[PDB]
Amino acid sequence: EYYEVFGEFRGVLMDKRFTKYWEDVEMFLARPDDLVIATYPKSGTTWISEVVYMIYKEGDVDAIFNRIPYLECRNEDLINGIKQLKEKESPRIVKTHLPPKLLPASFWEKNCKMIYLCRNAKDVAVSYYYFLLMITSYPNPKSFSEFVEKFMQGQVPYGSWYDHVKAWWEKSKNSRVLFMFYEDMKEDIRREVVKLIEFLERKPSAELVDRIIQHTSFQEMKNNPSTNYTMMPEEMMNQKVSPFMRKGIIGDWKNHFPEALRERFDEHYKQQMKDCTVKFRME
Amino acid sequence: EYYEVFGEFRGVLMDKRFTKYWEDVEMFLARPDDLVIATYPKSGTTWISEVVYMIYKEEDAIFNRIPYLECRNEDLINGIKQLKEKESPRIVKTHLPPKLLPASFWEKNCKMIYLCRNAKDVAVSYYYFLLMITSYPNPKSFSEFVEKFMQGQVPYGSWYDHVKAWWEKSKNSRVLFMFYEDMKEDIRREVVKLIEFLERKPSAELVDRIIQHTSFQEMKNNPSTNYTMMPEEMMNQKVSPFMRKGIIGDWKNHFPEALRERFDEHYKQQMKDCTVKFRM
Ligand SMILES: Nc1ncnc2c1ncn2[C@@H]1O[C@H](COP(=O)(O)O)[C@@H](OP(=O)(O)O)[C@H]1O
């Protein structure tokens, strides 16, 4: 059952396997040069992770989940992201989906640089729906509408999308925390890549920016076994049900939200984000 | 499908995930002080592994403390990688017949321990293992599985060829040969023998500690050794538990009269000229 698999932890619904040994996350030790990449699930985490990795390697083309460990991921003794990080050489790149109040405090104390990425809410809901169908140990939603009712209530893994975006937007007041959008990478990739190269204190030569653009397109990454998640067992992630690199577009909500549901969602959204100044792209 | 999952490799039926990158196993580099623990599947590997570990030490999972050499599942599981990062002295687990073991182990004259169990009881234990592993097709019936076992058409091949080849290798003083039934009927003697082979001093305290920590009851309730630290998506113990019965003679509850006579007759032909001594 749904609530046998997921449980509320300090006000946030979570996979019980990731909270059984919470002490290991709470007491994590950060290093001054660690870089944190944070996102709400299904907002483009894999895409921006590959872009940053290429920058670290000066455009020189192991699975991505080994090169950039998923911090809180844990499944008893078979999978352990904290252990992977303790054995990783500096400078480390860290992936997470946690809201600010649950992130290890050591990261704030050492003032580490961080990058936060978001995507428009309706398109996130469609992508997250297919993800639950893909993960074998997660109960399949009865219908898309049923899933959306839960999304609006914050009753899905990692909690409320609204609370997540608003809290991280507040944190981005700091010059060492960069805030970005999926739709901006889609409509103006060259500008977004140059911005990332400069934030990471490197030089944006024309040759470098070009290698990155060609290597990280949707067509390329869909055929790259290192980034398309085929290096992960079908017993856990069944891509025959739904592929990881699905569509990669803006606007798929138009093929899933019935008229009546869309109006209720948008109305609810306005009340939740009323006083938030974040600037999403007109689409 | 059975043959979509398994394929013959150099005359031995194997899980295709363990042979896709065979070069990594073939070229493996051994160290002079490495110790190899070898067995045919379901003969008591976990039991003797814990005994040897306690000896070395005078709670991470056992599959992390003692890496499974040829085990591989793309980039999620890799036993060779685990061994390259392990500090000496290393303890290595394997189910490979002598002709497939990395040659570096023979070249450096490493010490090894081989363990076996009577064939009929191995067949019962292996049958439940296939039901437990989610990615392995469930046999239609026990009899169907036994027909395949006699033909050597199960993972890791012929049990008969495996035991006969390792018995010949045990002529070497650095390769110790042991039996599951001897550990069951005379544990104190088998433990003292292992302590001496590993060049350590057998004492009252040491032998008794190991005896009580390695009983079937103790290991069944130890999360480090009962395999509950391994995902249910891969190993479903609701179908059948890893620490199942732990006895001698369960074949009496599974083999019909007619099948037993055919099996024993076949066994005779296969083991005709082998001097190995199983317990009555
Ligand atoms: N290079 C790329 N260009 C565009 N979209 C990409 C991409 N790489 C991954 N994606 C998309 O990012 C989403 C996965 O997000 P995450 O990595 O955070 O889990 C998927 O969305 P869709 O399901 O809408 O296709 C996926 O197709």
Ligand SMILES: Nc1ncnc2c1ncn2[C@@H]1O[C@H](COP(=O)(O)O)[C@@H](OP(=O)(O)O)[C@H]1O
């Ligand atoms: N301490 C112990 N005492 C007795 N039997 C043990 C044991 N530890 C494991 N076993 C048995 O060894 C078999 C598993 O073998 P392996 O370790 O090679 O995979 C199982 O046999 P059964 O299925 O007959 O119960 C299991 O119960």
